[PDB]
Design a protein around this nucleic acid. Structure first.
Ligand SMILES: [Mg+2]
Ligand SMILES: [Mg+2]
Ligand SMILES: [Mg+2]
Ligand SMILES: [Mg+2]
Ligand SMILES: [Mg+2]
Ligand SMILES: [Mg+2]
Ligand SMILES: [Mg+2]
Ligand SMILES: [Mg+2]
Ligand SMILES: [Mg+2]
Ligand SMILES: [Mg+2]
Ligand SMILES: [Mg+2]
Ligand SMILES: [Mg+2]
Ligand SMILES: [Mg+2]
Ligand SMILES: [Mg+2]
Ligand SMILES: [Mg+2]
Ligand SMILES: [Mg+2]
Ligand SMILES: [Mg+2]
Ligand SMILES: [Mg+2]
Ligand SMILES: [Mg+2]
Ligand SMILES: [Mg+2]
Ligand SMILES: [Mg+2]
Ligand SMILES: [Mg+2]
Ligand SMILES: [Mg+2]
Ligand SMILES: [Mg+2]
Ligand SMILES: [Mg+2]
Ligand SMILES: [Mg+2]
Ligand SMILES: [Mg+2]
Ligand SMILES: [Mg+2]
Ligand SMILES: [Mg+2]
Ligand SMILES: [Mg+2]
Lengths: 134, 187, 51, 147, 124, 53, 128, 52
RNA sequence: CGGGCCCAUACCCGGCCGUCGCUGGCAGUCGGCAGAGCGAGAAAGAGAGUGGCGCGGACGCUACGCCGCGACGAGUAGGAGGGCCGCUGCGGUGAGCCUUGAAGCCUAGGGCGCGGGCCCGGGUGGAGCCGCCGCAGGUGCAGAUCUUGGUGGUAGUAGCAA
RNA sequence: UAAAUACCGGCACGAGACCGAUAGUCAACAAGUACCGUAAGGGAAAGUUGAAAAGAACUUUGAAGAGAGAGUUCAAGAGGGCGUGAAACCGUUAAGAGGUAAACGGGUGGGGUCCGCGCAGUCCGCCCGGAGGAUUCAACCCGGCGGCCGGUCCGGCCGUGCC
């Protein structure tokens, strides 16, 4: 149950906020879970998706075990494009099929200084939380 | 082709209590059986009164109860009220009484018990005397309610001592024209 | 809870003036009341002959 | 509960319970209680005699607090003290009589309406009536005045 | 008491089905599965219940004891009976009549037992 | 129009009374606010009697 | 071999046609759902000769045969298996009726249990 | 519709306490609890009391 | 003036429905620990005492239930009662229903109720819905030269002639 | 000269037994907008493809709108005012009928479309007889559980009981 008297349970308000969130909030919404091995080796459960990460598709018509590289993150439509998840149009052109990041599992992150800083921050937060809990 | 009138064919009496009190309904079941299976009219009167509305079973006071039980001849009998027995404050001596009633107020119960009597419920009464033998059946003043001072011959009519409906009692409220001989007429 | 709502003899102590409500009929075992000797003695014989 | 009202049983009937001949008009007799002298005159005479006119004197600035005076009767008189007092008084043999303060209880005048138990008392009241004083004396006791 | 409990639950229980101008009660120990004071399986001091065994063969006869009214866990004693039809009926009839255990409903109990045994008998 | 025995009344509803109707829906909020201000003042005046002089 | 009820009396119905609302044949806005005519000049209300009849209480059916289906049973709507043990002991007088909302996989189970319990089902092969 | 419809109601304290007492009394009967629908069949004793 | 004959919702006999009355009957289902009854012109005991083998017995009683006797049945304005008649929302309850298909819609299909209406079958449809106990209401249309929207006959007509 | 007091404007908020696109603000949408009046002012209608445009490549008749094929989709029976798609009204197919306008109530008859998945007709207990097969009955022994008791068994608890 929610006890904070300054956040809503209003369905309409939550939908409006989600569909009108600015880009830097779209980034936070567009988060995907790391694989089992990455999760074990980083102590971090999820990471906002980036443009050049290897991922897998877990649900839908394109689910499988193949490793695909993200092509572009289309924040306006809340979908991401992978390098070989695509269908065939009528004329013969191949266009990409959008997939929600919540149905995708990250396989190998694109590391830079800021990404590493995010990972270490999340790891430290989970460590302090576990110390408090136990 | 029958020459009859159907105005008064349907009687209006109460066939069952209007209340939904489960305890009262259990009492009604018991006394229905008693009055059907015995030839004593005490049970018939008792369930007739159990059916009635609160206004038709007014409370009975200790003063009336003591007077009617101290009437000569009816010594150490059981007084039966299908209403409420209520404490009376301007009485000093309470005799050893034997009471059966639907409910007794707390202070009246204390007075009766401290005097040294006994208070019963109607199921205990049915077990003690199924036919109501050795009982005194009483009831409170049915016309004690204040609404009865407004009924009858209308006011403003000769020889009618009927209370009028006035928002307040005072000098300026309904005392001049029909009530004075100086202000026109007096009925 | 007993102190809160009082007993039949002892009134509630955490209420300024409260005591438990009373029972209009004590023995609610109607069948036991009906098939008791004192009552069963004072009845007329049943008529269960359908005419 | 609108499901128990008379409007639900009048659905379908044309006039909604107000008759076809004389319709439900808006104010066919006048607003409020007007006409009390002309066309409601006999209603006013038959149920409100004395409603018109003036009578008595006028008081410009009345004070109910000034006129305040509660009354008690000898029937209720002994209920103003603990019955322990009455038991002790009827039990003792010296003859000392208990003191009653109707002013302390919240009464000012003592009226004598009914029987008084045969037991000496002293009543401390602000006002008395002749019969109340007579009954107190007949019991055997005093009436004192207080301010 | 039983009559008071019935006056509470006669129209406001959770086992009550009221449709198609018929009324039914679905409490466990109710023979004939009808909303009735006599056949109610919860409000009485002593009831019986004939239910099919979970094994799929025979019947289970439930008796309510005398002591633990307010102790639900140890209130009903179950008797599993896996015999032939006539002797199952005889066993139930003796359990009711000889013990004088609420004899208002022995015929209903053996009717239910016969129905359950017929049901356990394979269909043609 | 009076009908039969009744008590003739004088309702003071001939003005524009619906324009001024003061509801009390904020009564619990007002009570909470009063109690909170009471606690704030009591804690502000640290050792002094909470009910003033 | 359909199941038979305990007894099958000769059901008598005082009327088989339905009471149609007055003047519903001349309009489409007027359904045949019966409404009592209340007009001051209505010949149907005044019970003129050769007009539409009105539903008197004298048309009520026999209480011994009321609600009896032509098979001789009385219907009972059931939504799942647990509501058939209800009709277990009303075997010869009352039949079962599966709701329109129940899906096929559950209708199969209800029908199988009813066949086991010898309770008649009026729509036993509905969906399949 | 107006905001000054009589939304709230008033009940006497004596009969409020009466109702509380009645509810507590009913909550100690296995028949009434099972009729309300609780799965109390394996409960040892219905006025279930546990230590502090 | 005479016989005969014809028929109304009137009268007679019979069946069924409801209302009214008898403020009628039934807790007695008291069973091997047992002994079957309270209907018959004429009050009140299947009264108690003191001396002269074989293990058996249908249904019933949601007492707000069931059963039995008689009589009665017109209806505007109007009054009252009963609705397991209907609509929307809330509190409890149905170990309720539902992508193996909810609501809604159509139906020369099968039925129930005097009726308000309701339940099944078939098709379409694609995401929610309902039973019982209570609570609440912006709660039921044929009419208002009613409001809004749409569609007819006129009618392939009048007309497209300063 | 602070506080207790008022607040349908404004900046943020939170909630609802409220309305659910003829409702709820006039305004769920490029609404004080389009439009009307010289002006003061007046003032609307208008939501929904699909999960994802995968929004129909290509062949062919036609100037073209527009069709017939092919393809996407679970579904085009979702084809850019495209969820579901009722009534009035219209076209066509099938059936029936047709000189007192049509229509209606009561009673039959005739024909249809469907249903019964009708077409050899019900069963349920007791007894007699005929064929068969069993762990198989009564009684008895052991063990466990339960119901009613001891005229007046021993021990407990409780009292809207008392001394
Ligand atoms: Mg927080
Ligand atoms: Mg009449
Ligand atoms: Mg009358
Ligand atoms: Mg009328
Ligand atoms: Mg009227
Ligand atoms: Mg009129
Ligand atoms: Mg008038
Ligand atoms: Mg008026
Ligand atoms: Mg009038
Ligand atoms: Mg006329
Ligand atoms: Mg006749
Ligand atoms: Mg007649
Ligand atoms: Mg009539
Ligand atoms: Mg959808
Ligand atoms: Mg509403
Ligand atoms: Mg209309
Ligand atoms: Mg022309
Ligand atoms: Mg021209
Ligand atoms: Mg809140
Ligand atoms: Mg619209
Ligand atoms: Mg609008
Ligand atoms: Mg719409
Ligand atoms: Mg709508
Ligand atoms: Mg649309
Ligand atoms: Mg949508
Ligand atoms: Mg589809
Ligand atoms: Mg579609
Ligand atoms: Mg469409
Ligand atoms: Mg057509
Ligand atoms: Mg043709």
């Amino acid at each position: 149950m929610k006890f904070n008297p300054f956040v809503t349970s209003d369905r309409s308000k939550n939908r409006k906020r989600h569909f009108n969130a600015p880009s830097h909030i779209r980034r936070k919404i567009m988060s995907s879970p790391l694989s089992k091995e990455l999760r074990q080796k980083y102590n971090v459960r999820s990471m906002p998706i980036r443009k050049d990460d290897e991922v897998q598709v877990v649900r839908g018509h394109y689910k499988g075990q193949q490793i695909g590289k993200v092509v572009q993150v289309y924040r306006k439509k809340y979908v991401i494009y992978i390098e070989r998840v695509q269908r065939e149009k009528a004329n013969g052109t191949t266009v990409h099929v959008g997939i929600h990041p919540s149905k995708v599992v990250i396989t190998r992150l694109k590391l830079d200084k800021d990404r590493k800083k995010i990972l270490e921050r999340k790891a430290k937060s989970r460590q302090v939380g576990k110390e408090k809990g136990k | 082709g029958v020459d009859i009138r159907h105005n008064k064919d349907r009687k209006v009496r109460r066939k069952e209590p209007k209340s939904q009190d489960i305890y009262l309904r259990l009492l009604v079941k018991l006394y229905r059986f008693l009055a059907r299976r015995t030839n004593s009219t005490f049970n018939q009167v008792v369930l007739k009164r159990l059916f009635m509305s609160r206004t038709n079973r007014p409370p009975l006071s200790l003063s009336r109860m003591i007077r009617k039980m101290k009437l000569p001849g009816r010594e150490n009998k059981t007084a039966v009220v299908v209403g409420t027995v209520t404490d009376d404050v301007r009485v000093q001596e309470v005799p050893k009484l034997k009471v059966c009633a639907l409910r007794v107020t707390s202070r009246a119960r204390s007075r009766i018990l401290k005097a040294g009597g006994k208070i019963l419920t109607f199921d205990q009464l049915a077990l003690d005397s199924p036919k109501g033998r050795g009982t005194v059946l009483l009831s409170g003043p049915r016309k004690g309610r204040e609404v009865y001072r407004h009924f009858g011959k209308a006011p403003g009519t000769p020889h009618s001592h009927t209370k009028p409906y006035v928002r307040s009692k005072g000098r300026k409220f309904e005392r001049a024209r029909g009530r004075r001989a100086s202000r026109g007429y007096k009925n | 809870l007993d102190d809160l709502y009082g007993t039949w003899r002892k009134a509630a102590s955490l209420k300024s003036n409260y005591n438990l409500p009373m029972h209009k009929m004590l023995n609610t075992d109607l069948s036991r009341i009906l098939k008791s000797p004192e009552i069963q003695r004072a009845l007329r014989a049943p008529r269960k002959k359908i005419h | 509960p609108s499901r128990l009202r008379k409007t639900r049983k009048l659905r379908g009937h044309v006039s909604h319970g107000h008759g076809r001949i004389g319709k439900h008009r808006k104010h066919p007799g006048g607003r409020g209680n007007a006409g009390g002298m002309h066309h409601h005159r006999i209603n006013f005479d038959k149920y409100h005699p004395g409603y018109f006119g003036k009578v008595g004197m006028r008081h410009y600035h009345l004070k109910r607090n000034q006129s305040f005076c509660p009354t008690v009767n000898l029937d209720k008189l002994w209920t103003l003290v603990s019955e322990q007092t009455r038991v002790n008084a009827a039990k003792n043999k010296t003859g000392a009589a208990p003191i009653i303060d109707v002013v302390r209880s919240g009464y000012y005048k003592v009226l004598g309406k009914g029987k008084l138990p045969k037991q000496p008392v002293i009543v401390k009241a602000k006002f008395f009536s002749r019969r109340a004083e007579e009954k107190i004396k007949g019991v055997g006791g005093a009436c004192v005045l207080v301010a | 008491s039983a009559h008071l409990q019935w006056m509470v639950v006669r129209n406001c229980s959770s086992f009550l089905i009221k449709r198609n101008k018929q009324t039914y009660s679905t409490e466990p120990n109710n023979l004939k599965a009808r909303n009735s004071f006599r056949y109610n399986g919860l409000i009485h001091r002593k009831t019986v219940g004939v239910e099919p065994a979970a094994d799929g063969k025979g019947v289970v006869v439930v008796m309510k004891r005398r002591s633990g009214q307010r102790k639900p866990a140890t209130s009903y004693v179950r008797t599993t009976i896996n015999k032939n039809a006539r002797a199952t009926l005889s066993s139930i009839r003796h359990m009711i009549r000889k013990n004088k255990y609420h004899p208002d409903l022995r015929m209903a109990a053996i009717r239910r037992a016969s129905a359950i045994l017929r049901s356990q008998k394979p269909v043609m | 129009a009076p009908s039969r025995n009744g008590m003739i009344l004088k309702p003071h509803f001939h003005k524009d009374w619906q324009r001024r109707v003061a509801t009390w829906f904020n009564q619990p909020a007002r009570k909470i606010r009063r109690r909170k201000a009471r606690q704030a003042r009591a804690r502000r005046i640290a050792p002094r009697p909470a009910a003033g002089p | 071999a359909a199941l038979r009820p305990l007894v099958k009396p000769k059901i008598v119905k005082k009327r088989t046609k339905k009471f149609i609302r007055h003047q519903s044949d001349r309009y489409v806005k007027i359904k045949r759902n019966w409404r009592k005519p209340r007009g001051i000049d209505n010949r149907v209300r005044r019970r003129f000769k050769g007009q539409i009849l009105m539903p008197n209480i004298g048309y009520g059916s026999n209480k011994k045969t009321k609600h009896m289906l032509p098979s001789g049973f009385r219907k009972f709507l059931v939504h799942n298996v647990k509501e058939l043990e209800v009709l277990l002991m009303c075997n010869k007088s009352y039949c079962a009726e599966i709701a329109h909302n129940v899906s096929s996989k559950n209708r199969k189970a209800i029908v199988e249990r009813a066949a086991q319990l010898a309770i008649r089902v009026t729509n036993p092969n509905a969906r399949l | 519709t107006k905001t000054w419809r009589r939304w709230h109601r008033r009940v006497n304290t004596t009969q409020k306490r009466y109702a509380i007492c009645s509810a507590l009394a009913a909550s100690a009967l296995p028949a009434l609890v099972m009729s309300k629908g609780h799965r109390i069949e394996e409960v040892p004793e219905l006025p279930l009391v546990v230590e502090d």
